[PDB]
Amino acid sequence: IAEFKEAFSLFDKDGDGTITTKELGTVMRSLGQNPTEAELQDMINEVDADGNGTIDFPEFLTMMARKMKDTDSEEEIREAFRVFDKDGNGYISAAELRHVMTNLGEKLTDEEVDEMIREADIDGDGQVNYEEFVQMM
Amino acid sequence: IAEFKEAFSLFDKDGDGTITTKELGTVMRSLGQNPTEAELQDMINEVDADGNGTIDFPEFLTMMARKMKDTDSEEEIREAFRVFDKDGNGYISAAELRHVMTNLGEKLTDEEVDEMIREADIDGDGQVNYEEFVQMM
Amino acid sequence: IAEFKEAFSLFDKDGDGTITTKELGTVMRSLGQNPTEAELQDMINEVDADGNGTIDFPEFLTMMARKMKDTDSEEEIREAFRVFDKDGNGYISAAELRHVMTNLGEKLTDEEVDEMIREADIDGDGQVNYEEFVQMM
Amino acid sequence: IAEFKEAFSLFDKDGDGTITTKELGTVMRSLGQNPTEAELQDMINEVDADGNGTIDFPEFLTMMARKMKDTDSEEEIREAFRVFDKDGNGYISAAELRHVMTNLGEKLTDEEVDEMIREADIDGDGQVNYEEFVQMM
Amino acid sequence: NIQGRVYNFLERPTGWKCFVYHFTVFLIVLICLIFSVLSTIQQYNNLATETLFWMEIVLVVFFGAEYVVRLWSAGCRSKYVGVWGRLRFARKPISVIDLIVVVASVIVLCVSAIRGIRFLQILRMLHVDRQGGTWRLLGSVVFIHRQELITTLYIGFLGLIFSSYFVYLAEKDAIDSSGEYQFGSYADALWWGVVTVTTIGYGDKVPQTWIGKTIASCFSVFAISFFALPAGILGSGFALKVQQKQRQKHFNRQIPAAASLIQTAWRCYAAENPDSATWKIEHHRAAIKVIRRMQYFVAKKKFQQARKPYDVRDVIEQYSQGHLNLMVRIKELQRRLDQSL
Amino acid sequence: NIQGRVYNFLERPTGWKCFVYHFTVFLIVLICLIFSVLSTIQQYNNLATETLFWMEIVLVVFFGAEYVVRLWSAGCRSKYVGVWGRLRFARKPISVIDLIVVVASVIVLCVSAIRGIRFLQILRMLHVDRQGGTWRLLGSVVFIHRQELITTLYIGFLGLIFSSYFVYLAEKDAIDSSGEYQFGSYADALWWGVVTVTTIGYGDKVPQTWIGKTIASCFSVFAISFFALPAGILGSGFALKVQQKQRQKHFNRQIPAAASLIQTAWRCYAAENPDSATWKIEHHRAAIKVIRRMQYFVAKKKFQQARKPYDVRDVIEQYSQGHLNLMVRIKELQRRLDQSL
Amino acid sequence: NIQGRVYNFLERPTGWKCFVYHFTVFLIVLICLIFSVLSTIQQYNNLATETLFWMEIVLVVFFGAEYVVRLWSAGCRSKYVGVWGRLRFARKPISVIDLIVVVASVIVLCVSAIRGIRFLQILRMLHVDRQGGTWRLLGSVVFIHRQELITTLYIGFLGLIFSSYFVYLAEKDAIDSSGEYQFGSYADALWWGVVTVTTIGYGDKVPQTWIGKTIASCFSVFAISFFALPAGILGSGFALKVQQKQRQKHFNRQIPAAASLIQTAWRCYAAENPDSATWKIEHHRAAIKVIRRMQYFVAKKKFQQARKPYDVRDVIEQYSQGHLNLMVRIKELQRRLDQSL
Amino acid sequence: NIQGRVYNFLERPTGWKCFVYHFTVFLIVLICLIFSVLSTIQQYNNLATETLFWMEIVLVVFFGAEYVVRLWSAGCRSKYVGVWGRLRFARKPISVIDLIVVVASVIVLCVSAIRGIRFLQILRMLHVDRQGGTWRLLGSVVFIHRQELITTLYIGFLGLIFSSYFVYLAEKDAIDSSGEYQFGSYADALWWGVVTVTTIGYGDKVPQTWIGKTIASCFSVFAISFFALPAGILGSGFALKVQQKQRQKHFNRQIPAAASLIQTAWRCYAAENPDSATWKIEHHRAAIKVIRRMQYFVAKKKFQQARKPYDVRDVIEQYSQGHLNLMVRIKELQRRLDQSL
Ligand SMILES: [Ca+2]
Ligand SMILES: [Ca+2]
Ligand SMILES: [Ca+2]
Ligand SMILES: [Ca+2]
Ligand SMILES: [Ca+2]
Ligand SMILES: [Ca+2]
Ligand SMILES: [Ca+2]
Ligand SMILES: [Ca+2]
Ligand SMILES: [Ca+2]
Ligand SMILES: [Ca+2]
Ligand SMILES: [Ca+2]
Ligand SMILES: [Ca+2]
């Protein structure tokens, strides 16, 4: 509860009460991600709950309240994995998983993909059962 | 009836017969509101009844004829109040009403919001019955 | 038949076989109308029958073949007149007809509107029966 | 199989693994076609099978695998020919076929149209049976 | 103006008083019909005939007065004017029905029991639907779905004929429980088919041999839908038409289009006469006429789209127009910048 | 807050415990109705009457307690407050039905067999549908399709009347198999028509003369659809309404519109009084009022579009706004470039 | 050209004279069918047989003449040419039906009462629907809704079977009023089910024991809809198809797409032969072929979208194209401005 | 791979050989059911019982072999693995039905006439619909229209109850033609209502007093539609679902969205552990977590829109994104031009 106040304070950078898109872009530039204006607008719209175009503290609390591990999110992640998986089964070959994550979407680094493979394909087989991997998260 | 002629004359500023968007913007700048072109176009389209993009004197008379206090407007204002009201009842807490009017939409000044609260929450309770407030208007 | 060849030749201005939008704009500028690019594109699309964006001689012949006085056009003109006519009847007051034609759409000149009124409201009444006027055309 | 690798290599021009729109435009400029950015984007989207905006080698193999002479393509070409053919029959006059191919769509050269007519209207009649012509391809 | 007020009060009502009047006359007609139904029974024939005679004569006098008043008031509209205008007004099917009802009632009263007066009041019951408002909607929807109300009324009819013939062949010689041949002739089988494919099923004729029962079972589950199809088609058409009416363009968005159409049509008409005031904005004569023709065609094309409801076509064409204008502005800006530098 | 909790638990339920309570009371009412049905048979009349009397008295005591608790808890809402608020709450049709059921049951128990208690529990079976949620949807859909549920119920009725009269004329004098005149009077023919145009077909009355059978065959295939049309119309309307509900705007996209509407309305109200704080941003008085009126009209126009679902109108108007803004920016850029150079 | 005129007059009519001819032949066939129906009754058998024999022989001579004329005129189309073209034309189902009717009528006349001539004229009644226009629409709609006309015809059938078995178990041993076992075997219960789940209800079989009546009541209200579902599905499909046809792209907007498709296909074909005139705009051979393949795929993709009606997909893709072009122009303007400065 | 091939051949078929196998087994089951129906008749009982016993034993052996093969092959999927995976596979309703059929058939054969084998094969007839494909569509559509299939099944039921009670009151004491009281008790009136509001109309019970006939006429035309409404609702829902399926997004347009969703979810998971490789692009820890949470929410929001079909929402949001990007580019161009000058 009190931790979110510290997180909200650093994003604001001016102490007014609203996280404007410019402030979020400044925070990301400080991190060093170099985002796009469209991406920032999409993030704000996803987080905003009043349609005013700015993030309020109750809206930030609402965003930080709901988390993962819910059925509506685990099912979504399983369906996203099924999108890549061929032959209808529940097994994805390690080569396909490694190739997709390094090219499609936001390209992960080699170390991150290696850690993902190690944590997912814990067994010695060449295919990672994405069901158990999703259940782990 | 004759009063509308004086009101129409000052908006025109050239004595031709049509209130162009530029003339309305000039009047607003004289007042000191600094509007946007999109807002002026929306206002003209709302007032215009012939689709020519300009306000004619019969159109101005039509706009000034219909007024508030009708059922189709009182119900709309009540629904707008219900949008903010939670817990399904007909009571809005004073804190929520004061917070919303100073941030969302067109931000009212502190004096206007204080006058609104005094006229609405006439009783000493912390919640303003918006039904009686709408009935007052 | 042979007359259309002379009409098509002057619009072309280069003797290639297609009436480009630039050529039509040049012809209109020679006449002295000063059109807009959107209007020229709309005219070409209305006349064009092959979707290539240019007017061909068979397309010009097709455009010049079909004419007015057909039922599908007389009914359309009668409906357009009904749009202005109030009180459901078939009579339009001369003041309304004169006012509309000089302001809405493409503003006709005073002489043209006077000639239209004289040819339409041939009788001495203050209202022009648009049915007989349309039947005259 | 091995031939596609040589074809893919020259389109890439940098040896990374993806045929970007800029690389395709450079190849076309080397050929001397001078395309448009919209056309290149449409071609990439038609060939792309992962939605990433770039052509991958498996996608190139998929594109080069499926070919013409299938029923779903022969029927499409026959319908395209029927679009031009009037009077409901299966015969297109040589004049109409020659005129359309030199003006509409991408204007073919005179030699190409002459070769098309010779290969299509093999018989001495003035009308080319497009059914047999499509069956030839 | 009084003539127009009378015409609006009688035909095409728009208020509550006219609504009350029309509901009252419809209720009077319905009560007369109910009394006629009760009089058709021999039990009530003692005085129902006399009271219906009096009600019918007063009602026909009232309808004659209403019809003559409506005929007098029809002169308000431009189409109905003078003597020929009244005759053209009397050509309308509703006016023809009212005139036929009045004349037939007068003839019956002149020529004391009345036999055809029941049919006369049944026809009179049609008087409520003014200006064909009820029939026009159904006619428009049927015309829109003309190519699908024929398929269901031709495949369904053909299936009915074939199934009835097969049932007749299966149960041609089969004595029923009471000893009467159910499907004695093909006409009886056809009547059974018309009764079964419409989910009526009176029960007078039921197949007896197991072959006929099997054929009826195999065809009823399939060919019945081909006869209930028109109901579903028309219902979905009505719902879609209501949905489209919910998405109609505002009435103020077609006035400029109508003005442009009328002005272009008048300009084209005036271009025919060389001595006219339209030549204010010799070989140019053949060029101005083509320009005016194109302008008229454009104005007519826009007006039709103005009257039609909102659609994806409007969005795509409007975006194309806006994009062309924006591209022209960008091109002129670039050209001016290059010329300056 | 306890009053609000009680009101939410009784009326407009939102959880599982309230759902269980409502299902339990509905099941108790249904079981009482089933026992009443079994008691209507003379075989079970020995003790069913007594057990139903006991169940009815305990159930009416329970319903009286529930109704008084609901009346007490109705004070949570702003509309129902004080003494007149309770009376206004009791004016609702569901509250009227509950009060009538309770009072009538008490009167019957005071005045041991009960004859009207069957109708009382039949009416009590309506208690489940709270706040008119079931009836409101049907009422809205019927009101939307008002101009098409009348056409099918007027052309269908007229066709029924005409066909019944024609069948009566065809089969007026035709003795049936048992020697009883089927269509003795017009009432019998009308009953046959009401039975046939609804695809019921009991079989008590069947046309006998071939003329009547031919007329019934020719009209049944056509005029039956005019009576099944309301079902299809309402079904397609329900499906389209569900589809539109699937495309509703998010609840967070109308809060700014509501705020703007309320603020503009309050500003217009405050502009009436010259001595107010709204005059912070003499002939200017007549100008500020017009500006506030236009702003209020714009805010009301946007709020209605905000509550309506997504549509092509929203796309076209939003593109028009964006294009106007972009054109203004391009024009100002060009003007600045020209002024600098 | 005379052959084409004859073919157009006989098949795929497009005028009023051809419409009159087709309506006349259909009316003649219908009158012959009506006379056959009247002849099936023994009362009219005296001369109806002879007049039907004469009408049938003249009608079969007319149909033979029409069929040979149509076979001669079918050579107009490219597909039907020479000797094999006529045989391929005769392979069409309508031509097969006409040939079968003519041959069977000739055989019956050669081999004086005719028994199968009734079925022959029933089949002849199918002659009106030319080029399968009526059947093609229904086939297309059924194929579109294939995955939903099976669900309603499988869940409905399963519910019918289960309900019929339960009714048979409930009313296996129950003597009716007349002493005849209604549900003696499972076949009788299945017939009752096929009669009830289709809202036919003849009344020959009615459950008697209260258990069977309760089961029939509980299942009729639910499982009946599973059999009327295909009618509603097909009706809504027909209405939606009509609505989509109302929003078809103009015929002039697909000619450039067809031209591009044909030109790209011909270019791809000509690229196979190295010695061709297509090489006017050695390792480049493998590169030009890929370019032509991509161009052909793009042209085919655009042509399919050109033939499809207007849709949100077209709007979004066209806006994407326009936005990409505008962004390219803005980028080039910025690049030129930066390079100049 | 052989296990996967066997599983694909048995469950979720995708070819013609599997289609032929499934059609063959369904036809065998249907033929067995037909033979059972013929055996239920006492005429064919001589050898039908024995041949059905042999067919049933061979069929249950075949079904046991198929079920054990399917249970062995179910290990291909990740969910069904090991011993508990097989048990979880056996929990599916279709597997439960097959196991129940096999066990019950074995028990009946062990315990020579079989009475319940008819019900066993009726249940076996459900074996064709694999993976619940037929039931899932109906369940989804009913769940979508849950708020409208209850209104029609509650207003219709209430109208049925009220109308049946009114008819019972009107015709409580009315001797029929045969001297038997039609509506003796309320149960008989309720049965008549269930027969009439469903357009069945057996004819066993018909109102006799004119009051009952009038009530039935006045209510049948109205309350019947409230029971045919579910059929129309579900039919229109099926048609609209098919239309939406016709406008589905291409399968290649959701792969990047799925990749982004999975990558963001994994990044959020890895952000929990401070010692991870995700920290390559101390108070910054609380800031990176919020950024990753927002990115995950955006990716999830885009993926849902990617899986949904094309809609006006997609067009408006995509235009908003494009307009924002274009406005940003115009603003940066203006800023650079002003800074340079
Ligand atoms: Ca800020
Ligand atoms: Ca906010
Ligand atoms: Ca693994
Ligand atoms: Ca001005
Ligand atoms: Ca104006
Ligand atoms: Ca208060
Ligand atoms: Ca040119
Ligand atoms: Ca052209
Ligand atoms: Ca006049
Ligand atoms: Ca690259
Ligand atoms: Ca790729
Ligand atoms: Ca040839």
Residue numbers in the entry:
A (entry chain D), B (entry chain B), C (entry chain H), D (entry chain F): 10 to 146
E (entry chain G), F (entry chain A), G (entry chain E), H (entry chain C): 95 to 205, 215 to 384, 497 to 556
Task: Copy text from the publication.
The KCNQ1 ion channel plays critical physiological roles in electrical excitability and K+ recycling in organs including the heart, brain, and gut. CaM co-purifies with the C-terminus of KCNQ115, it has complex effects on channel kinetics, and is a required accessory protein in the complex where it is needed for trafficking to the plasmalemma, folding, and tetramerization. Here, we report cryogenic electron microscopic (cryo-EM) structures of Xenopus KCNQ1 bound to Ca2+/Calmodulin, with and without the KCNQ1 channel activator, ML277. We utilized a biochemically stable form of Xenopus KCNQ1 (xKCNQ1, residues 67–610), bound to Ca2+/CaM4 to perform cryo-EM studies in the absence and presence of ML277 (xKCNQ1-CaM and xKCNQ1-CaM-ML277, respectively).
We obtained cryo-EM structures for xKCNQ1-CaM at 3.8 Å and for xKCNQ1-CaM-ML277 at 3.9 Å, both with C4 symmetry imposed. The xKCNQ1-CaM structure is in the same decoupled configuration as the published xKCNQ1-CaM structure, with the voltage sensor domains in the activated state and the pore closed. We observe that the structure of xKCNQ1 alone shows almost complete identity with the density determined by Sun and MacKinnon4, highlighting the accuracy and reproducibility of the techniques used. The high degree of similarity between our apo structure and that of Sun and MacKinnon, suggests that an extra density we see at the proposed binding site when cryo-EM samples are incubated in ML277 is due to the presence of the drug. Thus, two independent data sets with ML277 show density for a ligand at the same location, whereas two data sets without ML277 show the absence of density, which strongly supports the proposed location for ML277. The xKCNQ1-CaM-ML277 structure shows a similar decoupled TM configuration but a differently twisted C-terminal coiled-coil domain. In both structures, CaM was modeled with Ca2+ ions bound to EF hands 1, 2, and 4. The C-terminal coiled-coil displayed a resolution worse than 4 Å and was modeled until residue 556. Our studies do not support such conclusions in so far as they apply to the closed channel with activated voltage sensors, as only a single binding pocket was identified with limited differences between the xKCNQ1-CaM and xKCNQ1-CaM-ML277 structures.
